[PDB]
Each structure stands twice: as structure tokens, then as C-alpha cells.
Design a binder for this molecule. Structure first.
Ligand SMILES: NC(=O)c1ccc[n+]([C@@H]2O[C@H](COP(=O)([O-])OP(=O)(O)OC[C@H]3O[C@@H](n4cnc5c(N)ncnc54)[C@H](O)[C@@H]3O)[C@@H](O)[C@H]2O)c1
Ligand SMILES: NC(=O)c1ccc[n+]([C@@H]2O[C@H](COP(=O)([O-])OP(=O)(O)OC[C@H]3O[C@@H](n4cnc5c(N)ncnc54)[C@H](O)[C@@H]3O)[C@@H](O)[C@H]2O)c1
Ligand SMILES: NC(=O)c1ccc[n+]([C@@H]2O[C@H](COP(=O)([O-])OP(=O)(O)OC[C@H]3O[C@@H](n4cnc5c(N)ncnc54)[C@H](O)[C@@H]3O)[C@@H](O)[C@H]2O)c1
Ligand SMILES: NC(=O)c1ccc[n+]([C@@H]2O[C@H](COP(=O)([O-])OP(=O)(O)OC[C@H]3O[C@@H](n4cnc5c(N)ncnc54)[C@H](O)[C@@H]3O)[C@@H](O)[C@H]2O)c1
Ligand SMILES: O=P(O)(O)OC[C@H]1O[C@@H](n2cnc3c(Cl)[nH+]cnc32)[C@H](O)[C@@H]1O
Ligand SMILES: O=P(O)(O)OC[C@H]1O[C@@H](n2cnc3c(Cl)[nH+]cnc32)[C@H](O)[C@@H]1O
Ligand SMILES: O=P(O)(O)OC[C@H]1O[C@@H](n2cnc3c(Cl)[nH+]cnc32)[C@H](O)[C@@H]1O
Ligand SMILES: O=P(O)(O)OC[C@H]1O[C@@H](n2cnc3c(Cl)[nH+]cnc32)[C@H](O)[C@@H]1O
Lengths: 396, 396, 396, 396
């Protein structure tokens, strides 16, 4: 015969009709493999102009992402978003700590509470620039002590006493990219400014319902005042929502609502769509304007991610799934028996182990379906080459 | 493009076809926000002639509503229903305690078991009326003691020794509205009478199956004998049921069956429809006659309420969800660890904190969908502007 | 308007199409009440010729029904089925103990291990017959002892030392009806005979798959040899199955498979249909020949029963649901805390409290839908007057 | 009437349309029995040329199958697959231990760590061949010791000091069949060779996604180099997958993915179809080329097996379900209370009790539906004579 029937449904005929499907309600029928997983290119687009080596993005949650988390996240091919549950000052400070982080040089010396190296952030208190970490790394040995204060040719930078990150994510001026979330109220315009000044690359307008006149004007504002800053619009779950925000000027959309971790109020309130039908719906529209979508919320394993990207998502934001990694802010562990952490509002190794592990699964995931890039995975579903199968309740 | 497709299903095409949907089987896709939540008007109709500032209503359950509960409930914008698991006398007494409650004046002085202020409910045993609480509140100071017996200009009323309730619910004669449930047996006609005399504003005919010749005649009776009393018909779940009761004369319908808390017998018996398809179905009919519907049963969070009202409900009755508030009758707490209360038949702060909190969520709920009033939320669904999405088992 | 739409689905359009519905997958929309529950006539047909006052029937399980259970069961309006996990002799003995039980007279005197009243089952060892229990009940007083051996006018019956059962179930010769289950192997023909001789009214051919050449011939056999004995055919779940058995001669069908309690092997094996689609399907066919159906298995509450009968069932068999009653054979209780009993193979008051309680719920169940008899409930569904509503997984 | 309607759906109309059904989402409506279960012929085809008496096959898991397990498995009518989590040498050794096992003769004497019988695997260190176990079994008695070293007529085989297996599975040269799994990497070609030399009958290419250029070439290779060796292709779940592998030359397909036990990575990853829709789909295609399918994964009880075979499967592979049997490799038991075993990666009696028990249920399963052979069960479903019924979530 050599004919072989036909299987699965096309993403459309499956996600565009009275569904309400979550990541666990379907699977993706496998294809033909003819290459190894390592060749699976994960290059993803965070925003129109910003692009990462991997599609991983950590959440602006007070328990997930902070200066530490963001840095590792960028070095490992992703990006982090500094939350905003702290005075604008301390947050914009966290951005700097990251935007300044040069692989090697100790950042955040100890002047006076934000051992003490006395001085005035460039005023010799107590090392020629342009030198390679090697030169000084040895110089310290003869210094018969440890560190070594660096500075310009006029006694006016920082200190320092297998570190390769081939995929890390820097900006034009070779610096780890960093983002942060803000609100849409007035007070945020200041906060934003401080952040802008601290060197932030992208600002995501943090909100449960981003389709408000408030988020709109906030977009237009930023888009105008700061033409060199990518803005990510409030949380949406439909195209009717994405439209405005896209017209207001967003450079990416953050999809998700009634998914992931809750804080207070009502995560499952009146409104709260399944994170698959949403990602599919919203992306399908967003792509029409070249606006990427971040699948924010509801990721528990690598599989979820593959599925997230396969439906139209360019990147995927995770919170909890990352919280257990060490680079997450906190302390309230019990080593006697089991897992319990604390989350507050208004185990799992270094991210340098975790992220590499995710990328493996994601590449492997793209391999099983015969795809060699997150882009060929998306092209395959919009074409119908990629076939899905729905799973029953009892089934699951 | 600027076109943007179409999403969700209209409430009809979703609730009028072999469904059997509960509050958790669907969500409500969000709209466009362009105003703040506080502007969300919750004015709701309890009955044809009675109207509250909020849509909240507490249940005639021996563990949920009693004189205390009702009072707070009315002051905070709702209304309570005194249960009827007590001799007609003690119940009709509870009504008075509420209908008499004047913000300030101590009610239910201690004559002789229903410190003692001796007298004869107006016969000087042991204060000029028309006086403002301030006048006497000071007078007591000079009285060098505490209280102060008040009375008419003929030595023949009561005593007294940020209290603002802008939204409280009073009747023409400025008094906290109060309701109570009764049965449809003979003995209830007396009970009813006592209640009528105690000043009750609405009487809800308590019953699992309200479409009986018994409830009908009971309606007609009351409607006749007491032309100034709003009657709420037995529990229904279809339009065929609501019809009779509406024709018998009801001024509101109480929808619900096989939902919420159980007592004895069979809550899930042969008959017991999902509280969403029912609220939708019954309301759709009731509105045709100007008869409001109380969505009674199955409310666990604010979300449920928004969904309840969005489907056609004018008000929502809660029992358990309120039981933990302090104004609920009881005592059997354990402060060592967790929740356990007792319910008997034939934690959570003051209601002045809870109700305000519900109203917040409900207003917020109306905000997310772009509605500015519970009425514009209903108008939007009957029009199809409001769009829903069904959720799978596995999904949920 | 006074029109009122249309609701629910007819039993057919709901149970005759790719369903596989269990008792919990649907509910029964309520009707109009215009009479009290006590007027709800539960007269049901166990077999073509045998008819009970109630539709209750206890299972031939070694832990549910035995001489004790059967007796109470018959007195309270039902019937029991003595299991067959004991030599044919002891089982056929249990039948007699029941077929002999006369309200008042002590049965099973103590001759010599099957205080001792010496004799030879009618041979004066150590009272005029036709006497009323009153006569002798007093006679014993003057006898200055206790009991009183009775006998024929030739010194050759039994002894004896608010008992009204208006609904009990007797045969022509005024004796509590009693049934028992047997197998279809050879050895059973003897067993059967002994039973036949002991006075059994109906024999149910105990089997997981009753549509076998074995059960068929076993039917034909009994039907022939004993023309005055009602036979209940092996367990079935389709009409194709019921046909043969009906043609072989059965006088009732026992529907059920992959439901209720398990013993060994595979209750949920390859084959094992939902007990609702089955009861509906099989009954629909059985009724065509005047052959009643016993809904055997899967009953946890009164509701289940109403639903069972409403779909076409004439009677309902229960096992576990009755096991906790006292009349059930056993002992392995712990009064310190909770429920645990033992079931072995190859709390809850007297049945005089339980059965009356079931009948209440069943009558009440028939009331809610507006039916006055189990027969008018069935007539209403086959007509479509009775309307059902399916319930989702997440719903349930 | 004597007509009797129509029930169930044909396997196609049920498994070839947006389903995603697992073994528990449906049941198989019973037929007509007219023969005893013991007459139910279970002869099944493992591969084109290899055929067993039963359809049972144990998994190549480091915790399920090893030399011991395989032997019993073959003797009881099945076959085992030696896993490959050990150097090629120790694995190929396990094959020999099995391919050599002659019912009676002690195998694997103790020369020197792979009491000691000194020698050189045939070089007299320290019995005429062709002798019956009886001859020597007695000879040992006069030997006044125990064992007895056997050898050729030139002092150059083995030793030895109700054993009937009517259904055991041997090859042409009367030896227990044995198989083993290998990978598709280079290193496996050696491993394979050693195995080939050890006498293995079938090699299953162990892989999560068997439709790779790697598995293909690996097939072609083996098929060529070893024309007398049956090859079982990587794990598949569609026909598009099976095609290649079949064209590459496989002699059987191993169906399954996202089912059973997990090890590491993502069992439920992007891809992972329900083991029923898959078995149905893949078999339907495979049978077109005479290529049998092993339903690998997701078996918890006999029922599952019957269902597995009924949908198109020729054999069924089990892992966990067998792990608890004694012939499974291991030790980490607690006899104080309950079940816990250990599974590691890169109770339940002898299999001589278990396998016989499975065969019973499987025969019984075929009986209930009226089938007398696993083949007539398959022929009945492809014809539509065999009818299925879907089960709801809530149902299940
Ligand atoms: N990070 C996320 O993606 C996400 C998702 C869900 C909930 N949340 C959190 O839950 C909290 C409460 O719910 P939310 O998300 O709707 O809060 P939000 O920050 O989106 O704003 C809440 C409401 O206040 C009003 N508002 C906002 N800015 C205003 C302004 N400048 N002037 C006047 N009114 C203004 C709007 O009605 C808005 O709905 C948020 O503060 C947010 O931190 C965040
Ligand atoms: N509050 C509610 O909305 C609600 C809901 C479900 C159950 N329940 C409680 O469960 C209890 C038992 O079930 P119910 O709700 O059907 O009880 P009910 O009060 O509605 O009456 C029970 C039955 O008694 C009969 N009856 C009622 N009044 C009669 C009269 N005057 N004369 C003759 N017969 C009369 C009717 O057959 C009626 O179905 C009720 O008493 C009620 O308190 C209440
Ligand atoms: N009581 C019930 O309704 C019910 C339901 C499910 C299982 N069971 C119990 O499970 C046990 C095992 O399964 P089952 O119900 O199929 O058992 P069964 O009593 O129906 O007989 C089992 C098998 O033995 C064969 N057989 C029966 N009588 C025979 C005869 N006279 N000559 C030759 N062969 C004969 C038939 O193949 C039959 O399928 C049964 O003994 C029964 O007690 C009972
Ligand atoms: N036994 C089963 O049926 C089964 C099912 C699921 C998972 N697993 C286990 O999970 C492990 C990891 O996942 P997997 O099943 O995809 O592993 P695998 O053995 O199928 O190979 C993994 C990947 O390595 C590459 N590869 C394989 N052979 C190669 C070669 N010769 N040259 C270059 N590249 C090659 C391919 O991309 C392949 O997808 C496997 O090793 C397997 O043991 C087994
Ligand atoms: O998918 P997880 O990681 O569980 O959820 C993380 C996401 O959930 C949302 N979220 C986090 N904290 C929250 C508090 N309240 C409401 N939503 C929150 C954000 O969208 C965040 O990116
Ligand atoms: O939704 P909750 O608060 O759980 O349920 C409260 C409602 O349940 C019903 N109810 C309360 N007590 C009951 C006892 N028995 C049967 N129904 C009861 C009433 O309709 C009451 O308003
Ligand atoms: O519905 P319950 O009471 O749980 O189940 C009782 C019924 O289950 C079946 N049954 C009882 N014991 C069994 C052992 N094995 C298989 N089925 C049994 C019989 O049909 C019995 O009437
Ligand atoms: O159905 P059970 O016995 O749970 O699963 C056994 C099957 O699961 C798969 N399997 C076993 N160990 C595994 C580790 N990782 C992934 N799959 C495995 C194999 O297909 C194996 O035959």
C-alpha cells in the first residue's frame, strides 16, 4: 500500500472552537527524526527588537526574580524581570547590579549599607582599565593580599579578587540584558524613569487585565518618551484585548490569566481562560503585527513549554518552576524532610544546571516532532503539518 | 488588519443546550476597561419592590442567619433571612430586634429572660425623645453612671449608654430591612402572622421543591391577606416551575436545588440541577415578568457571585461562605489548629469587613469585563456582547 | 406570555446514544406537586407473577443476605435472596427458616446442633393449634415457666414463649416470600431441588455473564421441571443478551456488570457497562415481553434507586448499602472509631428502620417529579414527559 | 418481536476520531457464550516468524526482566526481553543462561565469579550424554554425594544434582526463546553481535521515538547482516511512524509512548498518545503488512490486556505489573506493612502462578465476548461484530 492515512487535528480546528484547553488536555503526535537534538536551534524573540538564544524568561515575582536570578538567567540564554514590590529606588538599583555585571569583576562593593573598601563610587578611598581579567587576577598575587581597586587613568571603576557563557544575552554595549515590571498608575512613571536611567532593556506593564485605558496611555507614554525601550503589554487572553495594546504600541504581549500562582483577590474570578486556547488565540493575532507573545503562567515541566511554544508562543515565562532554584530570593528551608517555601505579598540546583536542563528537553521535544528550531515548530502547526490529539478527562 | 476575529459563545448557545453546567465549568472572557472599580454600581433588586445597594443576601439557615447576622448584613448593603428552626415566637422576636435596631440605641434591654433595668416595656421602672445620640451620649457623663432610660413626654422608648453605613438598607420608616423564611403548612400561617406583626419586609417560602399546590396556595394567601409584603417562592430550577409560582403571585424566585449545604434526606436526589444552567434558565423566564431571582446555593468565592449575577441573577444568597464570619450564631472553635464548626437540624472577621471585601471583588469582577453595573453585565450577556468559554473536566 | 419553553432531554435521546452513563452522570428535572408523599404507591413487580409492596430486594451475597436478612426484608415490603456459599443443605435450610417464620412463633427450636427442647421434629419429647398467639401467650403465664410446645390434635408443630407488618410479602399460603441464587453447573440441579422442596418462591441464576448456553438450558430445565417457580436470568447488560434468556423462559432479568462490589477476578474486565445505560437499554426490551428487570448493583443512596426505577427498572437489588444493617450476617466491629467490616469468598440500625427510611425517600423522590407511583414514573419517561439533564465530569 | 435493536459502536467509528482514549475510557459489550474458557486459544504472534502460546511479553526494564524472569516467562508460554543497562558482555551472558537452560540441568556452574566445581568450561577439572534426567538423577544416589559432572564421550557439557511446561516457548533446536533490547548508536552493533552469538531470537530496538533515521539504518543493518533474526522497531504511536520502520524491515512494532513507568526526562512530553487509540491506529496499519504489534505500556490488570489485544495487538508487554513477581531482579522489601520497591536508572508469587492466572482471565475475557481465540476477537472488531461503549470521566 505505502499510503498511510491521516491523523490528528490541525491546531486551528482544535483550538479555535468551544474548547478551553489547558496544557494537559492534548498531546502532540511525533514525526520523523533525522538529526540530533543538539542541532535544535532555540533562538527566540522576547520582543520585536530584543532576541534571546533560548525562549526562557523568569517572572517579575517577589519570590522568583531579583538581581541574582536575572543575571544567571541572562548568562544561561534567557532573561529575568525584576519584580516591583520594593521602593522604585531599590528596584532600579537591582537593575544596575545586573546591567553592570561583567563576568569576573566583583559588583556591589561595600561602601556603606544600601569588609568595607572606603571611597566615593569613584574618588579613591581605599589598576589600569582595558586590562584582561588575567593580568589583574595575577597582579593580586603579588599584592600579597586579595582584591584590587580598579580605576580610570585619572584615579577616578570597580574591584575584583570554566566561566564561559556562549549563549548569554547582552545588549549592543555588551551587557547582560535585564527587564522589570511596573504598574500603570502615576507613581510608576517616576519608578519607570529611575529604571530607564538604570539601564533596563524592557519594561513589562504588570497587570491582571491589561486592556485598560490605563495600560494604553501608559504604553503610548513610554513608547514616546523612551523610543529605545521595548514595552510589554498587560496580561491578555483574547485578540480583542491584544489589538488595543498592539495599537497603543506594545512590542510584545504577555498572555495569561487564571493560571499559575495566585496572590490575593481572585485568580479564578469571573474571567480566567485556559492557557493554551489563549496562547493560541492571542498569538495567532499578535503574529499578524510582528508582536511576539510571552506565554506567562502554568508551566510545570519541559513538556508544557514545548506545547506553549508550539501553539504560537515565542517565549515562556516561569515563576514557581524556578522558585526552587538557588538564584531565587529567600530562606525558610527544612532539610529534615520535605518541600515548603514562603510566598508573601502586598533542593533545585543553580540555574546554570536547571536552564541547561530545560534547553535539553525543549530541544529534545523539538526533535521528536522532527523540528529543528522553535520557528519550524510554529510554522508546522500553522501549516497543519503538526498534528495534535485531544485527551479526555478520564484519559488524563 | 485591525479586524480581530470573534471569541466565546453567547450565554444562550452555551446554557440552553444539554449542558448541566456548574459555576466552575466556564469562565468569562474579559473586555475593555476605561474606569475604576469603585464606580461599579452594585444596586440590586431583591424583590419587585425591595431593592438593596448590593446583591448580597444571607441564608435562612440555623447556622448562618439570625438577628445579629441580619442587622450587619443590612447595614453593609445586603439583607439577611431569619431561619425558622425555633418556635414562631422566638423567631418573630428576632425580626423585631432587627426592625428596631437604631444605630446607637441599645436594643433588647434586660427586663426578665426572653444587669436588669426594671420596668414594664414602657411603664417607668428604673430622657426626651427626638434628641440626637450626641445630646444623651454626653448627658450620661453628668449622670455619673452609664446608661440612660429614654421615654415619651409622658414617662411612657429604650435606653443607651466612625459609625457610618452609607449603603445600609432601610424601609420607608427608616429601619433596617429584614426577612425570614417559613413553611407552607398550616401552622406557618400563624408564625407568618406573628412575623408580619413584628415588622418583616419579605418572607421566603422555604422549600426544596417549591412548585407544589401547597406553596401556590400559601403564596396566594399571603399575597392577599398582606398586600404590603413581598413573597419569595419555593426553590425552583426550571421555567415550568417558576411559571406557577409567578402566577400564584411571588415577587421573587429563589433558584437552587442539589447545591450548597445538605441537612438530611437527599440533596443530590433524583432531582438536583447545576446552579448555572438553572440560574440562567429560570432567570431568562422570570425577567419576562419582572420577577427577580435569588441565586441560592453553591457560592464559594467572589467569582461565583459575579458568574451568578452575570447569568441572570439579581441577588445571591450565601450560607456557609458566611458561617465563619463572627455575626453567625455559634461556638465550637479550636484555636490550636484548624477549621471545624457544627451544623445541626430537625477566623473570618466581622461582616463589616467581609461584605465590604465581597463588594470589592464583585465591583472588580464587573470592571474586568468592562461593565459599570450589575445591570450592564446582564444586558451584555443577553445581548451576546458578553462572551463565555467552557472548561473541560481535565481543564478545571 | 404564559408560554414557558422546553427543558431536558427524553430518556431515549439521552440513554440510547454513545453515552455510557452511570447513576451519577445525570439528574431528573422536577415537576408539579399536588399531593403528599405518603400517597406515593411503590408497588413493584419482582417477577411476572410475584409482586412486592416496595421495589427493594437484597443481594445473594454471603455478607448481605441470609435467613435473618430475608425475613426482615420480606416483612418490610421487600424480599431477600439467600446466597449460595454453603452446602446446598444449609442453604435450603435457611430458606425453610424463612418460609416457616410465622410472626410470633419461635422458629428453629434447639433439638441438636444444625437450652434443648427434647423431641423428634414432631414426636413429643419435651397446646391446641388454630389458637391465636394471645391464647397461648397467656397460657405460658399459668405454665409458671416460659415456653409452650405446640402440636396437632394427635400429639404430633412448634413452640413459642406493636408487631404489625402491613406491607410484608407472603405467598398464597400466607408465608414470607423468599428467594435464593444458584449456579448453572450440574451440581446446582440437586441444590435447586432441595431449595424447591424447602419452599423457595424464586431462584435467580447467579452469574456474571448470563447469556450462556449453560444458563439457557438451566432456565429451560427449571421452567419445565418446576412450572410453579419464577426464574431470574443471569446478569445481562444489553438486549441481545436479554433476548435469549427471555426466550429460554426467564420471568425476570437481573441487570448489572462491572458495578457494585467485587470479589475476585475482574469486575471491570473487558466487559462492564454503566448501570444506567444498561438498565435503560435492557428494560426497554424486557418490558416488551412483560419480563421485569432488577437493577442489580451500584446503589449508594435513595437517589440512585429513584433513578434506577425511573429508567425502566421494576425493582432494585442492593448489597453493600444493606450490609451495615444489623440483619446482615457477621461480626468484626470496632466501636472505638470507624467503619470496617469483612467480606470473604471462595452502626446502621434494624432493617425495620432502614427499609422504612428508603421507602420514604423513594416516595419523596416520586413526589418531587409529580409521580404518584413507580409506574407513573416509568410511564412518564417512556413518554418524554419526564425530563433529564446530563452532568459534566467537572460538574459532578 | 424477536428483533432486538443494535448497540455499541464499531472500533473504527470509536477509535479513529478525535478521541485520545486510554484503556479505561471504554468497555466491551458481552456476547453469547457456548463453550468453556479453557477452550479459549491464546496463541499469539510476537513477530512474523516467532509465535508464542500466550500473548504475554515482559519488558526490557532493569527492574522487570533479566535471565531469571525471561526463563520462567518462556516456560509459562510467554517470552522476556533482557534489558540493556549493563555492559554488552553481562547482558549477552544473560541471554546464554536462558538459551542454555534445559529443564533439569543446573546452568551457570561456579567456575570463578562471573562451592566451586573446578575445570575449564569443558576440560575435566572436578556421565554419558543422551541420557534421560532420570538415569543420572538416580546415578547421583550411588555417587553417595550429590551432583554429577556431565561431558561428551571424550571427557570434554554441564552438571546436575511435576516439572511439565506444555506451553513453554522454544526454538527449532528445542531451547527457550529469549530476546533483548539494544540501542541504535554505534556501540550497539557490537553489543548486538555478542547477543547474536549468545543465541538471541529477537532484538527490540529500545527507543522513545523509533521513527528516526537512526533506528531505520539500524534495522536495515541487522535485517541484512543477520537474516535469521527478528527485529522489533522503536516505539511508535501512529501509522506514519510505523510505515518507515516497516519499510526499513522490522518484523514487529512496539507501540507505546507517554504510558506506563517513567525513568527521567519527559514521559508525558509534548508527544505521548493514549494507549488504545495508538494500539488501534498502528495495528490497523501494521496488519496490512503482516507486521505484528506489541502493546507496550499501561497494563494494570487482565482487563487491560483483553482490551489491548481486542484493538489490534498481537502481544502485550508488561513491566511494573510483573515487577512484584519473584522472578524480577531485586531486594528492598519491608514485611512489616506495605509495598515499596526501588527502580533505578542511568508479595506476588512465582511467575508460574501469575502467568497461569493471567491466561485464565484473558481466556475468561475472550469467553464473555463469545470469542474462542485472540484471533477471533480481533476479527470480530474489525468486522464490527464486537461492540464497544465509551465511558465518561465522571462515569469512570
Ligand atoms: N503580574 C501579572 O501579570 C498579574 C496577574 C494577575 C494579578 N496581578 C496583581 O494583582 C493586583 C490587583 O489586580 P490587577 O492586576 O487588576 O491590578 P492592576 O495593577 O492591574 O490595577 C488594578 C485596578 O486599579 C485601576 N487603576 C490602575 N491604574 C490606575 C490609574 N493610574 N489611575 C486610576 N486607576 C487605576 C484599574 O481599574 C485597575 O483594574 C495587581 O496590582 C497585580 O500586581 C498581576
Ligand atoms: N430552604 C431551602 O431552600 C431548602 C432546600 C432543600 C431542602 N430544605 C429542607 O428539607 C426539608 C424536607 O424536604 P422539603 O424541602 O421537600 O420539605 P417541605 O417543607 O418543602 O415539605 C415537604 C413535603 O410535605 C408536604 N407538605 C408540605 N406542606 C404541606 C401541607 N401544608 N399539607 C400537606 N402536606 C404538605 C409536601 O409533599 C412537601 O413536599 C424541608 O422541611 C426544608 O426545611 C430546604
Ligand atoms: N452474582 C452475580 O450476579 C455475579 C456477577 C459477577 C461475578 N459473579 C461471581 O464470579 C464467579 C466467577 O465468574 P462467573 O460469574 O462468570 O462464573 P459463572 O458461575 O457464571 O461460571 C463461570 C464459567 O464456567 C463455565 N460454566 C458454567 N457452568 C458450567 C457448566 N455447567 N458446565 C461447563 N461449564 C460451565 C462458563 O464458561 C462460565 O462462564 C461466579 O461463580 C459468580 O459467583 C457473580
Ligand atoms: N524502552 C522504550 O521503549 C523507551 C521509551 C521511552 C524512553 N526510553 C529511554 O529514554 C532514553 C532517552 O530518550 P530516547 O528514548 O529518545 O533515547 P534514544 O535511545 O531513542 O536516543 C536519544 C536520541 O539520541 C540521538 N541518537 C540516537 N542514536 C544515535 C546515533 N547512533 N548517532 C547520533 N545520534 C543518535 C537521537 O536524536 C535520539 O532521539 C532512551 O535512552 C531510552 O532508554 C525508552
Ligand atoms: O505559572 P506560575 O509560575 O505558577 O505563575 C507565575 C505567573 O502567575 C502570575 N502571578 C504571580 N504572582 C501572582 C499573584 N497574584 C496573581 N497572579 C500572580 C504572573 O503572571 C506570574 O508570571
Ligand atoms: O451554598 P451553601 O451556602 O453551601 O448552601 C446554602 C443553601 O443550601 C440550602 N440548604 C441549607 N441548609 C440545608 C439543609 N438541607 C437542604 N438544603 C439546605 C439552602 O438553599 C441554603 O440557602
Ligand atoms: O451495588 P453493590 O451492593 O456494591 O453490589 C452488589 C452486587 O455486586 C455483584 N457482586 C456481589 N459480590 C460480588 C463478587 N464478585 C463479583 N460481583 C459481585 C452482585 O451483582 C451483587 O448483587
Ligand atoms: O506499563 P508499565 O509496565 O508501567 O511500563 C513499562 C513500559 O514503560 C516504558 N519504560 C520503562 N522504563 C522506562 C523509563 N523511561 C521511559 N519509559 C520507560 C517501556 O515502554 C516499558 O516497556
Amino acid at each position: 500500500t505505502s499510503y498511510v492515512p491521516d491523523d490528528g487535528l490541525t491546531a486551528q480546528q482544535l483550538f479555535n472552537c468551544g474548547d478551553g484547553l489547558t496544557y494537559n488536555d492534548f498531546l502532540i503526535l511525533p514525526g520523523y527524526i533525522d538529526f540530533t537534538a543538539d542541532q535544535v536551534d532555540l533562538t527566540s524573540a522576547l520582543t520585536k527588537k530584543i532576541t534571546l538564544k533560548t525562549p526562557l524568561v523568569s517572572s517579575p515575582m517577589d519570590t522568583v526574580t531579583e538581581a541574582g536570578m536575572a543575571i544567571a538567567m541572562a548568562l544561561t540564554g534567557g532573561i529575568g524581570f525584576i519584580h516591583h514590590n520594593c521602593t522604585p529606588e531599590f528596584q532600579a538599583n537591582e537593575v544596575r547590579k545586573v546591567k553592570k555585571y561583567e563576568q569576573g569583576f566583583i559588583t556591589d562593593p561595600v561602601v556603606l549599607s544600601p569588609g568595607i573598601p572606603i571611597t566615593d563610587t569613584g574618588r579613591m578611598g581605599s589598576a589600569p582599565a582595558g586590562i584582561t581579567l588575567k593580568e589583574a587576577n595575577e597582579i593580586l598575587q603579588r599584592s600579597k593580599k586579595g582584591k584590587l581597586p580598579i580605576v580610570n587613568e585619572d584615579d577616578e571603576v570597580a574591584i575584583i579578587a570554566n566561566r564561559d557563557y556562549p549563549l548569554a544575552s547582552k545588549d549592543a554595549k555588551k551587557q547582560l540584558l535585564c527587564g522589570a515590571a511596573i504598574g500603570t498608575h502615576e507613581d510608576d512613571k517616576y519608578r519607570l524613569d529611575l529604571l530607564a536611567q538604570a539601564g533596563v532593556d524592557v519594561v513589562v506593564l504588570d497587570s491582571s487585565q491589561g486592556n485598560s485605558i490605563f495600560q494604553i496611555n501608559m504604553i503610548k507614554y513610554i513608547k514616546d518618551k523612551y523610543p529605545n525601550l521595548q514595552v510589554i503589554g498587560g496580561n491578555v487572553v483574547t485578540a480583542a484585548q491584544a489589538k488595543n495594546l498592539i495599537d497603543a504600541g506594545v512590542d510584545a504581549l504577555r498572555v495569561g490569566m487564571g493560571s499559575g500562582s495566585i496572590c490575593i483577590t481572585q485568580e479564578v474570578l469571573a474571567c480566567g481562560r485556559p492557557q493554551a486556547t489563549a496562547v493560541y488565540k492571542v498569538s495567532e493575532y499578535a503574529r499578524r503585527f510582528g508582536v511576539p507573545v510571552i506565554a506567562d503562567g502554568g508551566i510545570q515541566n519541559v513538556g508544557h513549554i514545548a506545547k506553549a511554544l508550539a501553539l504560537g508562543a515565542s517565549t515562556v515565562m516561569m515563576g514557581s518552576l524556578l522558585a526552587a532554584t538557588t538564584e531565587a530570593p529567600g530562606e525558610y528551608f527544612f532539610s529534615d524532610g520535605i518541600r515548603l517555601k514562603k510566598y508573601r505579598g502586598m533542593d533545585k540546583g543553580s540555574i546554570h544546571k536547571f536552564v541547561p536542563y530545560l534547553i535539553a528537553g525543549i530541544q529534545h521535544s523539538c526533535q521528536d516532532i522532527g523540528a529543528k528550531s522553535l520557528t519550524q515548530v510554529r510554522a508546522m502547526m500553522y501549516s497543519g503539518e503538526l498534528k495534535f490529539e485531544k485527551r479526555t478527562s478520564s484519559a488524563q
